Design a protein around this ligand. Structure first.
Ligand code: NA
Length: 266
C-alpha cells in the first residue's frame, strides 16, 4: 500500500508478512460501490455490476469501494480482488442488488466476501443468501454499522446482524470503540476503523472512518489466514479470528475484541 495506515500493524498483519504470508491465491469479493481499477495501486481480477444506473464495476463514483479494496490489499498484498457493485454513488443500493452480488460471488467461487454496507432492515432473502454463501464455504464479513448506540437495543446493520456473518465494529488507534460503531449481541470482532488512509478514485489517497473501513481489515486477515492454511474451512477461519481476538471490554460494545491475525494464523 502506498498510503501508510496504522491499522495494518494494529491487527498484527506484518507478523504474517514476515512469515511470508500475503494472501496469495485467495479470491476476495468487495461488495460496495465498485473499485477504481485504473488506480495504479490496485489490480482487480474480475467483477460485476448490479446497479442499473451505474453499469461499470471497475469505476467507483462513491469512493468507499476503492478505499475498502486498498485496505484488503494493505493487509493481504497478494489477494485477488473482485469488484461487485451493489451500491450506487450515494452509497445506497436496493436489497435485491446486494443479493444478486452475493449469488455472483458464490457462483464465481469467492473465498471471502466483504460487505462494506449495511441497512436498518434485511430480509428473509438476504439472510438466505449469506447463509448459502457460508454453507458453500465462503468467509462472509460485514461492517457492523455506523448507527452508534440505542440504549440496550442492538444497532447492528444487516447483513452483519445475521449469525452466519462476521459483524465487524470499529476501534481507533488506542482500541477505543469509535462513537459511530454499532453495538449489540450480534457484534463479533473489532478492527481499526478511524481515519484509515487508503486508495481513492483517480489515483488518490485519503483517510476515512467507518465500520466499512473496519470490515476489510478482517476480510484481509481471512485472506492471510487462508494463505497459511488453505485447507481450513470458513468455520475454522472464523473460529480462529474470534477465539484469538484481544479482549477489549464488554462484548455488547466490542464483541470478542480486536482481531489478532498473528494469533489467529497459529
Ligand atoms: Na453476526
Amino acid at each position: 500500500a502506498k498510503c501508510v495506515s496504522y491499522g495494518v500493524a494494529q491487527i498484527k498483519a506484518p507478523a504474517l508478512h514476515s512469515q511470508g504470508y500475503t494472501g496469495s491465491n485467495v479470491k476476495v469479493a468487495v461488495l460496495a460501490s465498485g473499485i477504481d481499477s485504473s488506480h495504479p495501486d490496485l489490480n482487480v481480477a474480475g467483477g460485476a455490476s448490479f446497479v442499473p444506473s451505474e453499469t461499470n464495476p471497475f469505476q467507483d463514483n462513491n469512493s468507499h469501494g476503492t478505499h475498502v479494496a486498498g485496505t484488503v490489499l494493505a493487509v493481504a498484498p497478494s489477494a485477488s480482488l473482485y469488484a461487485v457493485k451493489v451500491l450506487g454513488a450515494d452509497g445506497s443500493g436496493q436489497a435485491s442488488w446486494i443479493i444478486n452480488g452475493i449469488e455472483w460471488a458464490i457462483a464465481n467461487n469467492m473465498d471471502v466476501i466483504n460487505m462494506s454496507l449495511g441497512s436498518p432492515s434485511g430480509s428473509a432473502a438476504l439472510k438466505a443468501a449469506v447463509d448459502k454463501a457460508v454453507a458453500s464455504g465462503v468467509v462472509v464479513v460485514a461492517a457492523a454499522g455506523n448507527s452508534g448506540t440505542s440504549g440496550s437495543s442492538s444497532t447492528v446493520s444487516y447483513p452483519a446482524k445475521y449469525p452466519s456473518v462476521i459483524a465487524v465494529g470499529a476501534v481507533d488507534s488506542s482500541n477505543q470503540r469509535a462513537p459511530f460503531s454499532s453495538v449489540g449481541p450480534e457484534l463479533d470482532v473489532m478492527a481499526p476503523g478511524v481515519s484509515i488512509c487508503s486508495t481513492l478514485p483517480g489515483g488518490k489517497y485519503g483517510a476515512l472512518s467507518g465500520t466499512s473501513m473496519a470490515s476489510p481489515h478482517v476480510a484481509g486477515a481471512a485472506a492471510l489466514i487462508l494463505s497459511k492454511h488453505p485447507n481450513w474451512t470458513n468455520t475454522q477461519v472464523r473460529s480462529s479470528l474470534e477465539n484469538t481476538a484481544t479482549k477489549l471490554g464488554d462484548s455488547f460494545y466490542y464483541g470478542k475484541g480486536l482481531i489478532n491475525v498473528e494469533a489467529a494464523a497459529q
